Design a protein around this ligand. Structure first.
Ligand SMILES: [O-][O-]
Ligand SMILES: [Cu+2]
Ligand SMILES: [Cu+2]
Ligand SMILES: [Cu+2]
Lengths: 546, 540
């Protein structure tokens, strides 16, 4: 680390005046504001502007996750793969430490900002705010203040901040949560940091900004299509856009199921890794879909289209997702979901034969000082079982089942209530390597598939998607409402789930194996699943075949 | 002042330099090689101009302020805006305005060279400054299968040279991407503050970025939704999106028709103005008005439930603030170019008819020039800019008239047409959009090419209030292809045009009457249009 010593990750140091401060919902935090906003903007701006040799630079911190796969804090890189854990049971705990690192670095930069900028009269007051600040989370599954949305702050190119010593003075500055921008294309950074979808041709992170058939200089900064991201985040079955039907965002239904379903062991909950389908709704699968929906992954689509609903961006891409500032807010909420699930599943910690094996893994590259052995070591999962050992908390884990229902279950229950006491789910199992490491999206349909439109909620008969953000991998989709609509159109027949595997060119991959099945139970989930139909690959138009 | 507008001064090493297509120019600047000197000059000069203070009348703000809000003086002329809309001096007033912008930028380029270029490189940089002219945006040309905003306009940053540091290239905010002030424009010092659409709450110009039901802080900079603007620019009948149907962007057909239809007088060509025929209602200003709408967006909300949100408003749709968006000038550069083309193939038609004749001698306030006969400072008049080359610029397409009709055909190439006659003040001066349909109108979707049976639109670029007495506005739409499809689907029935008048809230203004008619080829009137009702939740 800096100074040639390991960087010890502690979380923000304990101050008895500041007992377990909470990580707040970033929309709530923003709306209530403004010293903490100022501190966060100014500190993160400094961190983003730090040199590439500075290991606490935003680029280097993002770089721990994936590309450009260099060392960090003396820990060799070049494994290509990054330090991040994906498709394994230490997914939640590796990221718990990662998110704490980011938060700690920000806090330390806040302290430096105060020392260099804040007059004597205000220093204790600014330090108090730095000490009470924690990294906000993005609640991707909560309705914004009828729909899910990206954080308000993320959709603002500029932000007004205080100017210490100039009371009332405010200045509008570039918002470091809107994008991460470098001084040149990331493909041309000094060795060994070059990033080399045309991500090499990006200077800034983008959401849905990268499309084929535009000048390559447009990719330098493809912009933040936050409206398109919001639309994706609100994915739901296609039939729900017809008159006479109510919609439910699939992401909120999934998250409510995740938090409320009992009986999963840690290995089931923690990861997509697969080595009963009812238990395949897992944290990592939901997190993977959100990555897709925020960033976009399709660069192109075959044929002629005036309205272009595709476009790719950093959040969909494992190697470069960590550069988008929303990455950290996303992972802060994944940490929060982990803490919530831990709270209502108190005994289920690396408790199954498969995850037990990974419990003791070093969470490289993150260092801590072991007090018992007097050695600098790597974090291990047990070190962060209690997130409060890192000196943060969440309001929801301060005391939880009613909160979960209030935040994530109202609309699902409101709409499910209109239909019979049955549940349906879709099980999805695939290999993350079926396209040679390349990402892909699995779309499921009930009924005939439009051979030129097999993509999203506007696609005829669309039920839902599973994103391969990249042993097998599993996910699960709600299917109850989509089955009801199908049955009403088909004399009560159970639909055959039809699936298309879509690549980044918007083309259907015919040799990617996906095991899809529909399962039914009597009774609603939020109050015995049997398989009722086997999936089948759908064919698409010849011009849309990979 | 007075600030004498002359165009860029003549230099014999630079004979009548052309205003280039901005995509061609951008590609020349960035592709031929690394010596992107004009690109650097334009970016650096426009940045300087944009950062000048409000009390500098050659600041970007004040130049844009000539057109509309905040309606102040300019060049000692007391300050509705100075801009001419809905009159036959529309092309000439703007010809001078675009020249002012070009000249101020050129002067700033010279200042940039004096400040930043070493003595030994001054001649090279001056040469490029003297060759540069304001590029035009060819809104009707297929971008290098679809019409598009300029490449450069869609780029948040642009790399520029640093004079004296070869290979010291540097990425800088692109002043063509947006105009950004340091504070919200509703809070500027008096008398400059901008105070239906929350433009007072913008710090930056935006395309489709203002939508209801988002936090107001989002409006400070609503972004540049250039993909959405491109979609609008490629407006065409709804049926062309059905499987098996080729599409043709209406804007290109309109532009082709404008340039190639013979026999218009100046009053017909120059303006939407109709002073109390239909074949001759395809005019320059109407096309220009639709392009404003398509670039900026004018609808702030939409009634009802919509997952996909295709609305959103922005500066270019709004008369009082459109000039702040840097693309405004590029648009107007092409409108000037279309005027020059039309003049070239209609060379006797210049304020030549008893309608436009009286406007010929209007002073084009606030623009000053030096009179050589009286040795006096006077206002520009239309006749002064009849030959645009007197302002020391040209266009490639008019520098060689010989092949102009083929060039027009290459770039932009029974009949049915739609005639549209409307009052700009049908909603007291507020903007609106006239959408025309063949067939049943969807009561919840009556907006654009995704709306069932949509055929085309006419945008009222306007913004206790009435029009000048005896004056209305006209536009024309192509309808041939749309009538073919409608007949094919409807047992050969000639469609009755159905129209909806949409306001900035996405609601239908049921009390607005517009004269819409369908004509067929000598065109005969074959059907009169009728307003269509929409859902009750969508009615104004
Ligand atoms: O996983 O980011
Ligand atoms: Cu992630
Ligand atoms: Cu105007
Ligand atoms: Cu205009």
């Amino acid at each position: 680390g800096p100074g040639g010593s390991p960087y010890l990750i502690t979380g923000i140091p304990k101050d008895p005046k500041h007992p377990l401060p909470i990580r707040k919902d970033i929309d709530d935090w923003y709306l209530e504001q403004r010293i903490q906003l100022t501190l966060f903007v100014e500190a993160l701006t400094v961190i983003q502007n730090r040199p590439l040799n500075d290991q606490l630079s935003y680029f280097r911190l993002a770089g721990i996750h994936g590309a450009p796969w260099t060392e960090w804090d003396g820990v060799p890189g070049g494994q290509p793969t990054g330090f991040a854990v994906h498709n394994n049971y230490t997914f939640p705990t590796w990221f718990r430490v990662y998110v704490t690192l980011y938060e700690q670095v920000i806090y330390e930069a806040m302290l430096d900002f105060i020392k260099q900028n804040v007059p004597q009269n205000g220093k204790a007051d600014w330090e108090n705010e730095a000490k009470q600040w924690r990294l906000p989370y993005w609640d991707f599954a909560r309705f914004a203040r009828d729909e899910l949305r990206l954080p308000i702050l993320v959709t603002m190119p500029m932000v007004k901040v205080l100017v210490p010593g100039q009371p009332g003075k405010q200045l509008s500055k570039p918002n470091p949560l809107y994008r991460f921008q470098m001084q040149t294309l990331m493909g041309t950074l000094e060795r060994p940091y070059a990033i080399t979808l045309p991500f090499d041709k990006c200077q800034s992170t983008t959401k849905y900004g990268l499309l084929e058939n535009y000048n390559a200089d447009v990719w330098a900064d493809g912009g933040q299509n936050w409206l398109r991201a919001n639309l994706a985040l609100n994915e739901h079955p296609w039939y729900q856009n017809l008159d006479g039907w109510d919609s439910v965002p699939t992401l909120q239904d999934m998250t409510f199921r995740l938090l409320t379903t009992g009986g999963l062991n840690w290995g089931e909950f923690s990861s997509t890794r697969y080595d009963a389908p009812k238990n395949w709704m897992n944290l990592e699968a939901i997190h993977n879909n959100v990555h897709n929906w925020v960033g976009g992954f399709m660069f192109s689509r075959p044929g002629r289209h005036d309205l272009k609903l595709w476009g790719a961006g950093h959040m969909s891409s494992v190697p470069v997702a960590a550069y988008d500032p929303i990455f950290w807010l996303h992972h802060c909420n994944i940490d929060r979901l982990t803490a919530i699930w831990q709270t209502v599943n108190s005994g289920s910690w690396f408790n199954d034969d498969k995850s037990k094996v990974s419990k003791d893994d070093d969470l490289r590259p993150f260092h801590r000082f072991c007090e018992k052995t007097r050695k600098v070591v790597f974090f291990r999962s047990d070190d962060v079982k209690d997130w409060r050992s890192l000196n943060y908390d969440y309001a929801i884990t301060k005391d939880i089942r009613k909160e979960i229902s209030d935040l994530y279950g109202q609309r699902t229950k409101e709409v499910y209530k209109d239909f019979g006491e049955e549940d349906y789910i879709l099980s999805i199992r695939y290999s993350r390597y079926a396209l040679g490491g390349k990402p892909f999206q699995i779309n499921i349909f009930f009924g005939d598939v439009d051979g030129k439109d097999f993509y999203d909620a506007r696609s005829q008969n669309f039920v839902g998607s599973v994103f391969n953000f990249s042993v097998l991998s599993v996910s699960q989709l709600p299917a109850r409402l989509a089955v009801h609509y199908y049955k009403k159109q088909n004399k009560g027949e159970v639909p055959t789930p039809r699936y298309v595997v879509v690549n980044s060119q918007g083309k259907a991959e015919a040799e990617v194996k996906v095991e899809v099945a529909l399962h039914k139970t009597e009774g609603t989930f939020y109050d015995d699943y049997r398989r009722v139909a086997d999936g089948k690959r759908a064919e698409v138009d010849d011009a849309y075949r990979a």
